Design a protein around this ligand. Structure first.
Ligand SMILES: NC(=O)c1ccc[n+]([C@@H]2O[C@H](COP(=O)([O-])OP(=O)(O)OC[C@H]3O[C@@H](n4cnc5c(N)ncnc54)[C@H](O)[C@@H]3O)[C@@H](O)[C@H]2O)c1
Ligand SMILES: NC(=O)c1ccc[n+]([C@@H]2O[C@H](COP(=O)([O-])OP(=O)(O)OC[C@H]3O[C@@H](n4cnc5c(N)ncnc54)[C@H](O)[C@@H]3O)[C@@H](O)[C@H]2O)c1
Lengths: 342, 342
């Protein structure tokens, strides 16, 4: 009732890495968004022109050494935070922006649905947001879309849902050595085991967030989540510039999650990640099965993680600016849609 | 800012046919909805107990001969109108409810997005809704989901969209003689031609609504829509209790639509409807292709029209009750999701 609608929105960015620089380039293309400032803590970006960093020539938008200075001088309506995955780090970044009376989108995986896993941090964020009449959303391809929002959306044509099973199968081949390491690519089984114990081999971050969003959306409770991270052993040679997988070595990580209530399995999410999956007849894609009334079976190849994340983080901007105050989720907002290029 | 949120919602129904009786049964199953009244103009329903009509025993909810009496005595928060397809008929039904200060959902095909095709009727509805601080939504499987909402949602992971192509392929075999007639099943080509001219053979109602919703959502303009309705000629026998199709006869209707702007094709929607499509290797399903950055290719079998429509019309109820006043569309509301059974 009191919302003043706007026709264009100013955007700032905190974190000018792969995602945040993609986002900046995407915003620059939009008719109804304007990029007004960027911040990153690395000297290689600080005080440089964002246009020139992106290879577009000078556009007169600089990278600020400080995010609060950025916000105060450039006056964005919303800041996109593309920094870290973990609510223990990102919470203070989010709160810093909300205290300067701006909205936030983050792609941090633990922010897609933090209410069950990190209830104190969630409440702290929601409270600051409400106290400053601003909104926060965590989004992304996964978590934020393929294994949560999209699943939920499909249930909208169901009379009732019994259980969900979904899988995202990607190809790690495009990526660099850090990604290869986090999925154990190019390891022996023993090496993989020790990387899992040490945390060097991560698998996927977000299944708990997606499970809890789906559950909340459908009115279910979840009392237990079992996760497994198992090496994907190759029978063939798989090689990129940065990794060599021989037969018997690990080609990546099969991370799966099962969510229960009182020992009834309600949600099963699977995310095998490996290099060159087609070499052993694995087809990449996003696959959703809903068992209910009716049953639904649904994308090949899979939605690209990087490009899709850049996209959705951009595309949600107007909705978040226009949204009610608080810590919001994708389930609270109008359906995602692509914003018009200039 | 002024919205008082509710935890349960009372529902009324106008039109107790295949959809409206399905909807009533679905609402009766929900934890957070209560069915409070039904109206239909046929004597066979009027004054009968809805529970008994549905085979559930007496539940003490009757069918009213008058919808306004229904609303005044049973005090629903929202009325679902499942009567007719055409905005020329349904507009006055919708307006009648809005003037009694209640919200509306309708499944009328021309109400999914009436702003371009029927701008005077749309504005009249939007104006009455706003004047009475209530909301109206048109929804359904098609239009309302598969060839509009769902497509739009998928674009939310795109950087930009060039063009869309989508098809829904169903099987008419389950249906009765009226459906068979509207799709020309069991006709000769000459007969089909004359049924198209007379309006006995309809094809699909809604492509213009879906095209215009997708366009509006993406910020596109459409200046021309070309439609074709061509008979699907069988090479084999196809038979149900109510129809016999011999080789050379028509098995149904291939209705397609192409939407342009300045002669560039932006949206192509296809809905072949025929009996027993598998007999000539046609696979039923809903298929969406987005050409853009990135390209996206997406359900087999197709989302069931009847069950899915019952579902979505029910599932949107809380959102519409909670929504801002006016004539809304699926693009304005939170993502569809299944409501919890009691
Ligand atoms: N939800 C999803 O689907 C999704 C998808 C992609 C990435 N992510 C997450 O988004 C984050 C960003 O991914 P990326 O690929 O852009 O990573 P990146 O390493 O390429 O970029 C991170 C950037 O943030 C900067 N940065 C980090 N901490 C900072 C701080 N405290 N202050 C200022 N600048 C800081 C770094 O200097 C770097 O430029 C990661 O946590 C990633 O896992 C989520
Ligand atoms: N958007 C979609 O995907 C979608 C899907 C299914 C049906 N529909 C539409 O929904 C409508 C209902 O479909 P159905 O299969 O239930 O049709 P139906 O013929 O089985 O039921 C219509 C009912 O409405 C009653 N009725 C009609 N006009 C009335 C009036 N003026 N006052 C009171 N009662 C009245 C009839 O007596 C009948 O019981 C149709 O127009 C149909 O095309 C849309």
């Amino acid at each position: 009732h009191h919302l003043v609608p706007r026709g264009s929105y100013k955007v700032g960015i905190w974190g000018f890495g792969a995602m945040g620089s993609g986002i900046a380039k995407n915003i620059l293309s939009k008719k109804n968004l304007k990029l007004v400032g960027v911040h990153d803590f690395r000297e290689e970006y600080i005080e440089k022109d964002v246009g020139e960093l992106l290879g577009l020539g000078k556009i007169g938008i600089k990278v600020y050494p400080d995010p609060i200075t950025m916000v105060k001088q450039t006056d964005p309506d919303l800041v996109v935070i593309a920094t870290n995955s973990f609510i223990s780090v990102v919470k203070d970044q989010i709160i810093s922006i909300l205290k300067e009376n701006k909205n936030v989108i983050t792609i941090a995986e633990e922010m897609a649905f933090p209410f069950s896993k990190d209830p104190k941090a969630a409440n702290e964020i929601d409270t600051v947001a409400k106290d400053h009449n601003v909104s926060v959303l965590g989004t992304g391809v996964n978590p934020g879309f393929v294994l949560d929002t999209l699943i939920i959306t499909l249930t909208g044509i169901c009379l009732n849902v019994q259980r969900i099973k979904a899988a995202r199968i990607n190809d790690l081949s495009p990526f660099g050595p850090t990604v290869m390491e986090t999925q154990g690519v190019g390891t022996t089984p023993e090496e993989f085991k020790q990387g899992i114990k040490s945390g060097k081999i991560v698998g996927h971050i977000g299944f708990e967030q997606s499970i809890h969003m789906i559950a909340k959306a459908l009115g279910w409770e979840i009392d237990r989540i079992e996760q497994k991270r198992e090496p994907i052993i190759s029978n063939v040679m798989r090689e990129t510039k940065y990794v060599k997988v021989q037969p018997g070595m690990v080609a990546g990580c099969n991370h799966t999650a099962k969510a229960f209530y009182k020992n009834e399995l309600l949600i099963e999410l699977e995310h095998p990640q490996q290099v060159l999956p087609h070499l052993e007849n694995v087809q990449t894609g996003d696959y959703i099965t809903i068992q209910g009334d009716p049953d639904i079976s649904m994308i090949n190849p899979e939605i690209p993680g990087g490009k899709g994340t850049i996209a959705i983080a951009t595309n949600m901007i107007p909705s978040v600016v226009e949204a009610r105050p608080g810590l919001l989720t994708m389930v609270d907002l109008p359906i995602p849609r692509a914003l018009l290029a200039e």
